[PDB]
Design a protein around this nucleic acid. Structure first.
Ligand SMILES: Cc1cn([C@H]2C[C@H](O)[C@@H](COP(=O)(O)OP(=O)(O)OP(=O)(O)O)O2)c(=O)[nH]c1=O
Ligand SMILES: [Mg+2]
Lengths: 1005, 218, 419
DNA sequence: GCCGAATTAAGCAATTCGTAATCA
DNA sequence: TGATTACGAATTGC
C-alpha cells in the first residue's frame, strides 16, 4: 500500500455494514480498504456511568460547554444569564442503533463523525502503515484502527483515471420508443483506460438490415461479429445482433471504471438497456463488493425532493444507480439543472449555449461558405474548444437561425476552417454554434438502408463525445475535489444536498475546536421581518455617466462586525409606551457600554409594542462568524486563482466556484433566518438587516451632493459612525491626488441593498474612471471602518430606468478606456425573463433602439414620437397577423412542473397531468416544458379576452400545427403594446389606441 | 357487470360499473405486456388477475395495500389463505384479535369486512421471486391505484421501503398511512396501532368506523 | 403509526368536538394539531378555524310568549338572573356571548372553578350571570350527572347556588302568567328574574319561557350609584318615580337615549327593562357631560377623577394602614404574599391599577405625550398631538396626571428602597 | 420459512399576469 | 353591464 490517493468512499448495505475507501498508488494499482461503520452518540459522564448495557466503545472528548440558545423577550433591564454548563463528554460508538434519552449533538451524520474524529480528509494523499492493515482479498484490506493508519499525510500527486461515456439510439415509428416493441439500433462508446488510450466504437444492430446490405457493409470496411469473444475495440464500426450488443453493454458496464458519464442515462439509457436485456434474455447486470460478499442487480431508483415553502409539496425528482463497487455513475442532466439557468435543458440547447464562436468569411459563391476561427477573432480559447468539438460535429447553426451541414473541416494549429452548405450571407464576421439537426428520425427509420445506418452511427458517436466535451467544459473534477475537501463529504455526495447539509462538517470541526455544544429547550415561533432597502429612481433617461459602488459580502461582514450569533445574544428589551421606553433607554446606554456590547434597534415584534432593542456581546467570537470567515477565505482563494487565468475554460470554472462560495456564505444567514433549522435566530437576522439598511443610508447620505473642487473633495455630511462614537476623524473635507483643474458634482439616483448609483456631470469615460478610482480609495480610507469595503463596479452610459428593479444600460468595466467596446446590460427587463416570448423581445429591442435614435435626432413637434411609434407598431402587428410568416418557435414560453400548490384544481397541474395521460413521454416533477396559446383557425380578431388559460397547449419535439389551428396572437400583442405604452409620455392617444384595438384600459406605472 | 375482450389470456375481463372509466385504457396497456408476462408461470393463475374489479367502489372507505401477491399459492383476492397457513394473514389476525378481544378463531379474511378493500399494487408474481413483474405492471398499477383513491378516504400502505414515494405516484391528495409489513423481521408489526388510527381518522372525517372483528371466520 | 400519534389524534378529535365552547389557548392547540396532522398524513377532514363565533342556541329554543300545556314527567325549574353572561369550559378562560374576551375574575372564583372541574370531568359548560359585581351561577348541564348534586358541592365549596325547583304533575295543566307568578313568589328571591327554564329528567335540551308587556315611559334625569370601591351603576327616573333596570352603560349608548324623551320598555309584574335596538362619539360625550364633567368610563362602569392618595394604594396591597414612608418596608417582610405580588408585578401597571385607569385609552394617551426623566423618575411632560384629546375620557384621565406622576415617583423610589 | 436497513429542507423586496370576489 | 380590489403564482434582483 504505502502511498495512496483517495477516489471515492462508499457504503455496503448487507447483513454486516462496512465503509469502503477506494484509492490508487503512484504506479497505478487500485487499493480498497474496509472499515467497520458505527453509530455515533455524544453523552455526558453522568449518563455514561449509568448505561446499563455498556457501550461497545467510548472515547473521552474532554470538557465541553453546553449553552441554551433559546430566545425570550424581556420588559426591563433585569436580564438573566444564559444557561451554561461545563462537563466531561464521551463519544460512544454502537454496532446497532440505540435510543438514549439525553444525548446531544444529534444533527450531525455518522460519516462526518468518522472523518472528523479520525482526522481523515476525504480527498487527501496518505502514507499508510501495514501494521494496522490485514489482507482479506487480492486488492482489498481491512483496517480496525483508522486513527493510526492515517496519521501520516504526504503532498498530493497525480494519478491516472478511467472513463466510459455512452449513448444509445433506439428505433421508433410513431412516438417515443417502448421497450416491449421497439429495439435498439445503435450503441456508441468512448472509452479511456488507465494507460491513456482513447477508443471510440459504435455497434450497429444487423437484425434490421438485408443480407446483401450486410455484405456490402463488410465490403466497405465494417466488421461483423457473431459472438462476444470475437470483438476488438480497435474497430470503429461493428455490426452484430441485438443480443450480442446487449451482452457487450453488460460486459462494459460491469467493469470497475472510475466514472460512467451519461446525459439522461439513468432515466432512459441504462434503464432501457437493462429492461431489454432482461426481456430478450434472462440475464442481469451484477455488481460485486470489493470483498466479494455482496452482489446486487442494477435497478434505477427515484429520489423525490419536496419544497420548504407553503404546503410543502413535491418539487424535484432525480434518478440514481445502486452499484456497490465504487464506480461513480454521473448524469450531466441533473448537474446542469442544479448548476445553471436556461430556457430549455435538452442537449441541443446546452450545446448551443456552451460551444459558440465568431467566424470570419473567406469565400462565397455556390451554395456554401468557408469560415475561419482563430485567437484573433473571438477570444483566447473559444476557437480551441470549437475545433475540439468539430472533430465529431455534423451540423452548425449560423446567425442563431440557419442550420447548415458540414462539408469539409480542417483543424489548424490555432483555430479551425470549416466549409458549410449555406446560402450567401453579406457580412464579414458571423456567429457559429453547435445545435439542432434538421433531420426527421421517424422518416429515416421508416425507410431504413445502409446509408441511414451509417449516418445515425455518426450522430450517435457525436452524442457520446458531447458528454466528454461537457465534462471538460464544466470542470466536474476540480469542483468535486474542492467540495470534498471543504464540505467533508464523499466524492459521490457533493452534488446531492443543499446548504443545510454541506455546512455541517465545518460546523462540527469548529464546535470541537471551540469545545461548545448548543441546545434548545422550547419551541420556535416565527414572525415576519423586514429586508434590504431599495431606493426609487429619480428619472428614467439620464444621458450622463453613472458610477456604481458596491459593498463586498455585506451580510457576512455585518455578522462578523456585530458578532451576531444565537449564543451571543444578551437579550431583547421591549416597551409598550414612551415612559418605560425612555427609562429603558437611559438605563441601557450605561449598563451595556458600546465598545464591547452592540445594541440594535428593530421594528417591533408584535402590534402592541413600540420598541425593540437587541443586545449582542463581542468579548468571545461567535460560531456563525467563524463559518463565514472560512467561506470568505475560500472565495478569496478562488478569485485570486481566477485573476491569473488565461484560457476561457479556466476563467469560467473559477468564476463558477467563487460564485458558489458566495452563495453558500449568504445561505448561512438565510438559514439563521429559517425556522426549521438548528441555527434559527430571529434577532440575529433582524439585526443583520437593520445594520445593512443603516450602512446603505450612511453611504447614500455621504455621496449625495458631493463636490470635487481644486484637489479637495467635500462630502455631504459628517463621516460619523452611525452606531457609536470612535476615534476616527470626522472631517468632511479630504485631500485628493487628482488634477487641480477638475471640478465636478455628484448626485445619487438609485440603490439596492449594498449598492449606490452616483451621477457625474460629464460624458467622457476616462476621466470618470479616474475619479471613480480616487473616490473609492478615499471612501475606503476615510469613510468606512473595520471590515467594510466598497468596489467601483463599472460606468453606465445611456442608463434607462423603468421600475425599481428594471434597467438597461451600456457598461464600461473598471479596467477599460474610451476606445473599447461597451457591453449591453439588461436587468429585470422583458429580455431576460424566461416566460415572456421570443417575438416580444425582438420587437422591444428594435423599438427601444428606434426610440433612442429618434430622441437623439429630436423632432417632438407636439407628440410626434408617440404618433410615429404607435403607427409603426400598428402596421407591424397588422402585417404579422395577415401574413402569418413567423414560425411557432417565436411564440413559445417555458414553465417548470411541480406539485406545490394551494388547492388542487390548479389549471397548470391539470394541463401537465392530461399531457402525461395522453402521451408516451412524461414530464417529471422538476422538468421545464414549452407551451403556447392555440385557438381555432376560423375565429376572427377577438376584442374581449375572457379565458386565457384554457388555450394553453404543450409543444413537444414532434408538434405540427394543425390546418384548423392558429397561434392566439392577441395575448402576445396585448402584452407587447402595454410594454410599449408604458415607455412613452403621452396618455390620451395611447389610451384611445388601446381601447380601439383591445377594448381595455391600459395600466400605467 | 360488463365484459371486455382482450387479445391474450385470460381473453376476458368482467368488471363492475364503478371501474368503467379505466377499462379501455387498461386494455391498451395490457396488449403490449401480456406476451412477455405469460412466458412464465405466475402466482396467481392468469384467470385470477382481475377478480378484484368485480367489487364496487362507491361504498368503500379504507384500502389496505400490499406490493405483490404471495410468492406461492396466490388466490387472486389479496391477503387470503383459505387453509390459514400464510404468515402475514396469521399475524394480522393476531393483532386484530388482540385489539378486539376475540380469542377463539380459525381464520381471517379482509374481503368480508364492510367498507374495506384489499389491494395488491402488482397483480402478478413469479413463483418464488417477489417484485419480479414490476416493469410489466407499472402503468396499470398506477392507473388502478389512482382510480381507487378517488373513492376511499384512508389509504393504508404496508411496507416502508416499497411505498416510500407513494405521494409522487398519486396526483390528488388523500389520507395516507405507511407502516411495516406483517412479515417483517425485527418484529415491528406487533407494536403497530394503525387500525385504531384508521378508525380515529375516519371518525374525524364524519365517517363511520370499521368493525374490524367482522372479518373473523368461525 | 406510533402511540403518541394516536393520543395526538384523540386530543384533536376531542378539541374538535368542543369548539364553540372554547378559548384562545384551545384554538391555538387545535390549529397546531391540525397543521401537524395535515403535514403527517397529507390530508385531514378538519380545516383551520380563525373566527370561532361562540353560540348558545344549540341547547335552547325560541322563547315562548303564550300559555301552553304541560303534564307528563317531573319538571325542574331554574330562574334566569339579570346581568352579563359568561361561558366556562373545562380548563379554559372567560368568554362572553358574542364578544368573547379575556375578562378578569376573582382568584377565589377561579380556584372554585378549578376544584369543581377536578372533582368530576362530566361537565360540558357552565353559564354564569353577573350583576354589578355579584357573581351568580346561572346554568349547568351534564350528560351523566344530574343538576342536583353538582349544585350541592358547588354550594358546599362556598359559592352561592340558585334555588332550583322540582315539581311533579299528574293531570293536563295549563301554564300561563298565573303559574309564572306563583313560581316567582315561591322562589322568594329579590334579585331580578327574566325567565324560567323548565327541563325534564333525561332530556338534555333546556327550554325557557318569559312573560312581558310593551310600554312607553318618559325619562327625567340620570344619576349614578355606588356599590363598591369607585364603581358606578346608572339609573334614570320617570315622572311616577318607577325604578328601571338596565344591563350596562353600553346599553344606554346603544339605545341612543335622549334627554327628556320617551322610550319603549318591557314591563313585568315586578320590574321592567329598557329595550335596545332603537354617532357613537356624540352619545358617549352627551351621556357624560349630562351626568357631569367628573366622570369617565372603565369598560362597563363609571368613575370619578378623585384626588386619591396613599390609602388608595395601601387598601389593595392588603397591608395595615400607615402613612410613614420609612415603615413601608417593615410590613412587606411580614407577609410573603404581598412581597411576592409586588416583586412579580411591574411599576407602571401598579400605578395604573391603583388609580383604576382603563388600559387602551391611557396607553394611547401616553404614546403621544413626550416625557423628560432623570434617575428613573418623571420630571417633565408635554403633549404633542391632541387628536386623542378629542375624546372627553382622555381629557378626564389627563386631569389627574399630577397625582399619577406623584404616585409613580413614590412607587419607584420605594421599590428602589426595598429592592 | 417469510421484511428492513436512520437521518439529507436559506432570506426578503419588487413587478407582471390572470382569475375570483365585491361593489354600483 | 361594467370599475375596483384581493389573492396566488412565476420570475428576477439584491
Ligand atoms: C445574491 C444573494 C444576495 N443575498 C443578500 C446578502 C448579500 O449581502 C446581499 C447583497 O447581494 P450581492 O451584492 O449580490 O452579494 P455580496 O454582498 O456577496 O456581494 P459581492 O459579490 O460583491 O461580494 O444580498 C442573499 O441573501 N442571497 C443571494 O443569493
Ligand atoms: Mg456587494
Amino acid at each position: 500500500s504505502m502511498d495512496v490517493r483517495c477516489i471515492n468512499w462508499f457504503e455496503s448495505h448487507g447483513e454486516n455494514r462496512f465503509l469502503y475507501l477506494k484509492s490508487r498508488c503512484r504506479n497505478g494499482e487500485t487499493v480498497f480498504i474496509r472499515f467497520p461503520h458505527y453509530f455515533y452518540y455524544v453523552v455526558t459522564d453522568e449518563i455514561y456511568q449509568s448505561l446499563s448495557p455498556p457501550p461497545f466503545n467510548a472515547r473521552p472528548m474532554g470538557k465541553m460547554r453546553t449553552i441554551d440558545i433559546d430566545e425570550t423577550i424581556s420588559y426591563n433591564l433585569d436580564i438573566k444569564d444564559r444557561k451554561c454548563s461545563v462537563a466531561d463528554m464521551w463519544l460512544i460508538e454502537e454496532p446497532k442503533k440505540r435510543s438514549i434519552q439525553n444525548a446531544t449533538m444529534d444533527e450531525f451524520f455518522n460519516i462526518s463523525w468518522f472523518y472528523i474524529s479520525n482526522g481523515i480528509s476525504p480527498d487527501g494523499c496518505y502514507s499508510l502503515d501495514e501494521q494496522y492493515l490485514t489482507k482479506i482479498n487480492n486488492g482489498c484490506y481491512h483496517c480496525d484502527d483508522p486513527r493510526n493508519c492515517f496519521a501520516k499525510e504526504i503532498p498530493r500527486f497525480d494519478i491516472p483515471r478511467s472513463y466510459l461515456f455512452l449513448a444509445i439510439a433506439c428505433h421508433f415509428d410513431k412516438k417515443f420508443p417502448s421497450v416491449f416493441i421497439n429495439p435498439i439500433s445503435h450503441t456508441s462508446y468512448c472509452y479511456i483506460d488507465l494507460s491513456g488510450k482513447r477508443l471510440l466504437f459504435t455497434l450497429i444492430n444487423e437484425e434490421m438490415l438485408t443480407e446483401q446490405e450486410i455484405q456490402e457493409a463488410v465490403d466497405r470496411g465494417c466488421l461483423r461479429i457473431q459472438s462476444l469473444m470475437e470483438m476488438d475495440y480497435e474497430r470503429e464500426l461493428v455490426l452484430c445482433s441485438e443480443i450480442v450488443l446487449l451482452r457487450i453493454a453488460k460486459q462494459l458496464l460491469e467493469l470497475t471504471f472510475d466514472y460512467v458519464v451519461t446525459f439522461n442515462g439513468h432515466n432512459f439509457d441504462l434503464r432501457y438497456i437493462t429492461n431489454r436485456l432482461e426481456l430478450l434474455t434472462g440475464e442481469k447486470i451484477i455488481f460485486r463488493s470489493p470483498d466479494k460478499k455482496e452482489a446486487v442487480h442494477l435497478c434505477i431508483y427515484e429520489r423525490n425532493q419536496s419544497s420548504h415553502k407553503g404546503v410543502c409539496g413535491m418539487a424535484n425528482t432525480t434518478f440514481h444507480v445502486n452499484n456497490n463497487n465504487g464506480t461513480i455513475f454521473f448524469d450531466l442532466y441533473s448537474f446542469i439543472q442544479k448548476s445553471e439557468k436556461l430556457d430549455s435543458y435538452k442537449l441541443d440547447s446546452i450545446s448551443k449555449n456552451a460551444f459558440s464562436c465568431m467566424g470570419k468569411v473567406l469565400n462565397r459563391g455556390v451554395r456554401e461558405m468557408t469560415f475561419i476561427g482563430d485567437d484573433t477573432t473571438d477570444a483566447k480559447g473559444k476557437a480551441d474548444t470549437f475545433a475540439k468539438v468539430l472533430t465529431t460535429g455534423n451540423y452548425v447553426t449560423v446567425d442563431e437561425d440557419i442550420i447548415c451541414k458540414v462539408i469539409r473541416k480542417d483543424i489548424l494549429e490555432n483555430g479551425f476552417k470549416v466549409v458549410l452548405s449555406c446560402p450567401t450571407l453579406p457580412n464579414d464576421i458571423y456567429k457559429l454554434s453547435f445545435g439542432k439537426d434538421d433531420i426527421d428520425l421517424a422518416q429515416m427509420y421508416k425507410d431504413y438502408n445502409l446509408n441511414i445506418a451509417l449516418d445515425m452511427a455518426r450522430y450517435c458517436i457525436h452524442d457520446a463525445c458531447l458528454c466528454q466535451y461537457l465534462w471538460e467544459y464544466y470542470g466536474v473534477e476540480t469542483k468535486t475535489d474542492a467540495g470534498a475537501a471543504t464540505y467533508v463529504l464523499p466524492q459521490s455526495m457533493v452534488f446531492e444536498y443543499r446548504a443545510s447539509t454541506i455546512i455541517k462538517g465545518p460546523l462540527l470541526k469548529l464546535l470541537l475546536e471551540t469545545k461548545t455544544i448548543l441546545v434548545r429547550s422550547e419551541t420556535k415561533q416565527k414572525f415576519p421581518y423586514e429586508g434590504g432597502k431599495v431606493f426609487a429612481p429619480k428619472q428614467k433617461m439620464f444621458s450622463n455617466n453613472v458610477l456604481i459602488f458596491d459593498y463586498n459580502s455585506l451580510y457576512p461582514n455585518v455578522c462578523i462586525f456585530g458578532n451576531l450569533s444565537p449564543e451571543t445574544l444578551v437579550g431583547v428589551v421591549v416597551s409598550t409606551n414612551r415612559l418605560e421606553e425612555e427609562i429603558n433607554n437611559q438605563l441601557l446606554l450605561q449598563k451595556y457600554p458600546p465598545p464591547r456590547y452592540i445594541t440594535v434597534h428593530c421594528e417591533p415584534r408584535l402590534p402592541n409594542l413600540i420598541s425593540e432593542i437587541a443586545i449582542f456581546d463581542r468579548s468571545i467570537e461567535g460560531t456563525i462568524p467563524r463559518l463565514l470567515r472560512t467561506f470568505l477565505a475560500e472565495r478569496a482563494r478562488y478569485k485570486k486563482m481566477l485573476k491569473q487565468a488565461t484560457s476561457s475554460t479556466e476563467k469560467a470554472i473559477y468564476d463558477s466556484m467563487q460564485y458558489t462560495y458566495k452563495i453558500v456564505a449568504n445561505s448561512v444567514y438565510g438559514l439563521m433566518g429559517f425556522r426549521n433549522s438548528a441555527l434559527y435566530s430571529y434577532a440575529s437576522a433582524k439585526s443583520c438587516t437593520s445594520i445593512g439598511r443603516r450602512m446603505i443610508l450612511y453611504l447614500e447620505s455621504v455621496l449625495n451632493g458631493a463636490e470635487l473642487s481644486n484637489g479637495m473633495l467635500r462630502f455631504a455630511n459628517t463621516l460619523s459612525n452611525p452606531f457609536y462614537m470612535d476615534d476616527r476623524d470626522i472631517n468632511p473635507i479630504v485631500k485628493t491626488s487628482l488634477p487641480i483643474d477638475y471640478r465636478f458634482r455628484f448626485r445619487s439616483v438609485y440603490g439596492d441593498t449594498d449598492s449606490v448609483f452616483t451621477e457625474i456631470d460629464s460624458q467622457d469615460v476616462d476621466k470618470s474612471i479616474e475619479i471613480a478610482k480616487e473616490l473609492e480609495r478615499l471612501i475606503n480610507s476615510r469613510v468606512l471602518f473595520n471590515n467594510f469595503k466598497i468596489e467601483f463596479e463599472a460606468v453606465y452610459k445611456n442608463l434607462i430606468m423603468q421600475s425599481k428593479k428594471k434597467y438597461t444600460t451600456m457598461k464600461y468595466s473598471a479596467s477599460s478606456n474610451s476606445k473599447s467596446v461597451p457591453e449591453r446590460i439588461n436587468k429585470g427587463t422583458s429580455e431576460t425573463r424566461r416566460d415572456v416570448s421570443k417575438f416580444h423581445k425582438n420587437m422591444i429591442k428594435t423599438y427601444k433602439t428606434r426610440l433612442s435614435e429618434m430622441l437623439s435626432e429630436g423632432r417632438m413637434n407636439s407628440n410626434q414620437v408617440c404618433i410615429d411609434i404607435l403607427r409603426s407598431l400598428e402596421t407591424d402587428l397588422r402585417s404579422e397577423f395577415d401574413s402569418r410568416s413567423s414560425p411557432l418557435e417565436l411564440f413559445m414560453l417555458s414553465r417548470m412542473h411541480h406539485s406545490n400548490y394551494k388547492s388542487a384544481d390548479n389549471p397548470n397541474m391539470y394541463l401537465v397531468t392530461e399531457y402525461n395521460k395522453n402521451n408516451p413521454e412524461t414530464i417529471e416533477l422538476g422538468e421545464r416544458y414549452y407551451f403556447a396559446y392555440i385557438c381555432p383557425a376560423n375565429v376572427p380578431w377577438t376584442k374581449k379576452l375572457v379565458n386565457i388559460k384554457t388555450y394553453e397547449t404543450i409543444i413537444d419535439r414532434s408538434f405540427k400545427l394543425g390546418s384548423n389551428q392558429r397561434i392566439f396572437y392577441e395575448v402576445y400583442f396585448k402584452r407587447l403594446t402595454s410594454e410599449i405604452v408604458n415607455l412613452l409620455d403621452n396618455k390620451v392617444l395611447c389610451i384611445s389606441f388601446f381601447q380601439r384595438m383591445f377594448g381595455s384600459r391600459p395600466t400605467f406605472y | 357487470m360488463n365484459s371486455v375482450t382482450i387479445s391474450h389470456a385470460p381473453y376476458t375481463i368482467t368488471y363492475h360499473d364503478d371501474w368503467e372509466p379505466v377499462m379501455s385504457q387498461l386494455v391498451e396497456f395490457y396488449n403490449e405486456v401480456a406476451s412477455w408476462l405469460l412466458r412464465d408461470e405466475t402466482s396467481p393463475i392468469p384467470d385470477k388477475f382481475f377478480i378484484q374489479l368485480k367489487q364496487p367502489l362507491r361504498n368503500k372507505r379504507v384500502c389496505v395495500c400490499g406490493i405483490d401477491p404471495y410468492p406461492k399459492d396466490g388466490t387472486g383476492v389479496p391477503f387470503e389463505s383459505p387453509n390459514f397457513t400464510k404468515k402475514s394473514i396469521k399475524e394480522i389476525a393476531s393483532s386484530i384479535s388482540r385489539l378486539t378481544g376475540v380469542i377463539d378463531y380459525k381464520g381471517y379474511n379482509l374481503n368480508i369486512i364492510d367498507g374495506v378493500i384489499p389491494w395488491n399494487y402488482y397483480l402478478s408474481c413469479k413463483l418464488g421471486e417477489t417484485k419480479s413483474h414490476a416493469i410489466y405492471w407499472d402503468k396499470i398499477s398506477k392507473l388502478l391505484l389512482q382510480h381507487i383513491t378517488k373513492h376511499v378516504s384512508v389509504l393504508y400502505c404496508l411496507g416502508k421501503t416499497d411505498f416510500s414515494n407513494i405521494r409522487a405516484k398519486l396526483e390528488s391528495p388523500v389520507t395516507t398511512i405507511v407502516g411495516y409489513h406483517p412479515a417483517a423481521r425485527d418484529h415491528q408489526f406487533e407494536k403497530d396501532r394503525s387500525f385504531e388510527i384508521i378508525n380515529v381518522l375516519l371518525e374525524l372525517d364524519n365517517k363511520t368506523p370499521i368493525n374490524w372483528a367482522q372479518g373473523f371466520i368461525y | 403509526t406510533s402511540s403518541a400519534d394516536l393520543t395526538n389524534l384523540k386530543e384533536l378529535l376531542s378539541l374538535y368536538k368542543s369548539l364553540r365552547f372554547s378559548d384562545s389557548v384551545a384554538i391555538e392547540k387545535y390549529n397546531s394539531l391540525v397543521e401537524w396532522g395535515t403535514s403527517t398524513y397529507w390530508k385531514i377532514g378538519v380545516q383551520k378555524v380563525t373566527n370561532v363565533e361562540t353560540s348558545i342556541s344549540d341547547y335552547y329554543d325560541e322563547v315562548k310568549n303564550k300559555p301552553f300545556n304541560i303534564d307528563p314527567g317531573y319538571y325542574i325549574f331554574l330562574p334566569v338572573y339579570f346581568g352579563s353572561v359568561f361561558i366556562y369550559s373545562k380548563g379554559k378562560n372567560m368568554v362572553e356571548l358574542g364578544s368573547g374576551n379575556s375578562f378578569q375574575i376573582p382568584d377565589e372564583i377561579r380556584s372554585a372553578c378549578n376544584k369543581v372541574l377536578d372533582s368530576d370531568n362530566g361537565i360540558d359548560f357552565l353559564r354564569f350571570v353577573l350583576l354589578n359585581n355579584r357573581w351568580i351561577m346561572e346554568d349547568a348541564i351534564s350528560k351523566y350527572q344530574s343538576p342536583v348534586n353538582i349544585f350541592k358541592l358547588a354550594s358546599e365549596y362556598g359559592l352561592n347556588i340558585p334555588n332550583y325547583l322540582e315539581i311533579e304533575i299528574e293531570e293536563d295543566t295549563l301554564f300561563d302568567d298565573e303559574l309564572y307568578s306563583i313560581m316567582e313568589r315561591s322562589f322568594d328571591d329579590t334579585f331580578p328574574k327574566i325567565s324560567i327554564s323548565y327541563i325534564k329528567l333525561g332530556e338534555l335540551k333546556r327550554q325557557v319561557v318569559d312573560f312581558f308587556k310593551f310600554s312607553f315611559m318618559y325619562i327625567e334625569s340620570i344619576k349614578v350609584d355606588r356599590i363598591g370601591d369607585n364603581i358606578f351603576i346608572p339609573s334614570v327616573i320617570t315622572k311616577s318615580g318607577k325604578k328601571i333596570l338596565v344591563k350596562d352603560v353600553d346599553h344606554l349608548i346603544r339605545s341612543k337615549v335622549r334627554e327628556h324623551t320617551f322610550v319603549k320598555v318591557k314591563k313585568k309584574n315586578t320590574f321592567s327593562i329598557l329595550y335596545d335596538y332603537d354617532t357613537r362619539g356624540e352619545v358617549i360625550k352627551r351621556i357624560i357631560d349630562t351626568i357631569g364633567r367628573d366622570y369617565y368610563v372603565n369598560g362597563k362602569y363609571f368613575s370619578k377623577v378623585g384626588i386619591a392618595g396613599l390609602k388608595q394604594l395601601t387598601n389593595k396591597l392588603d397591608i395595615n394602614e400607615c402613612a410613614t414612608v420609612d415603615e413601608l418596608v417593615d410590613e412587606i417582610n411580614k407577609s410573603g404574599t404581598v412581597k411576592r405580588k409586588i416583586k412579580n408585578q411591574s411599576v407602571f401597571d401598579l400605578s395604573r391599577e391603583c388609580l383604576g385607569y382603563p388600559e387602551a385609552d391611557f396607553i394611547t394617551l401616553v404614546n403621544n405625550m413626550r416625557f423628560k426623566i432623570e434617575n428613573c423618575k418623571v420630571v417633565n411632560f408635554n403633549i404633542e398631538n391632541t387628536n386623542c384629546l378629542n375624546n372627553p375620557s382622555i381629557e378626564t384621565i389627563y386631569g389627574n396626571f399630577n397625582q399619577f406622576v406623584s404616585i409613580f415617583n413614590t412607587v419607584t423610589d420605594v421599590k428602589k428602597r426595598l429592592f
